[PDB]
């Protein structure tokens, strides 16, 4: 059914009190972190933890801006989760579940384990009623001017169901 999902406590997330996300979301936006990648769970948690602190301390967000992140370890990491507002895409933080692949994917795409985990996640969101059945899937760059989720990754998701052409 739903992939495992590594929680904030596991990667030692800082505590916050951020605005709630009203479910179900109408869109899914694919993003890459554009930073280092990670193929083992402990390396990925550290990466997630630093991102939360980067977003909070330098970008001044309320928390990590993603709802979830996916690692080349085939792991799905909880960003703010399903119930919190996001801080990933201008104008879509309250209606779009932001999912970031941990890594930089313009030249090379996430591995099979990552791509697979991402999809199982999306599937779960619909099944569970967190996403509308008719939801739209888009690339970060289709929405705003930004270098994400990277061409190689873009080419893959564009073949996904619901991808908005």
């Amino acid at each position: 059914v739903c992939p495992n999902i590594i929680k904030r406590s596991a990667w030692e997330a800082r505590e916050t009190h951020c605005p709630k996300m009203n479910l179900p979301a109408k869109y899914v936006i694919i993003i890459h972190t554009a930073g280092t990648s990670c193929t083992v769970s402990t390396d990925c948690q550290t990466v997630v933890r630093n991102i939360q602190s980067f977003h909070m301390d330098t970008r001044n967000f309320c928390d990590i801006g993603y709802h979830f992140l996916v690692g080349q370890d085939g792991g799905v990491y909880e960003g703010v989760g399903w119930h919190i507002q996001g801080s990933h895409t201008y104008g879509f933080n309250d209606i779009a579940l932001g999912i970031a692949f941990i890594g930089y994917f313009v030249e090379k795409p996430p591995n099979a384990a990552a791509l697979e985990a991402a999809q199982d996640l999306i599937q779960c969101a619909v099944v569970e009623g967190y996403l509308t059945p008719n939801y739209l899937l888009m690339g970060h760059s289709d929405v705003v001017n930004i270098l994400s989720p990277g061409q190689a990754l873009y080419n893959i998701i564009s073949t996904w169901p619901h991808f908005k052409h």
């Binding site: 977003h55 801080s87 201008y90 970060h140 930004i146």
Partner: peptide
């Protein structure tokens, strides 16, 4: 990442 908007 792009808060608010």
């Amino acid at each position: 990442a792009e808060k608010x908007x």
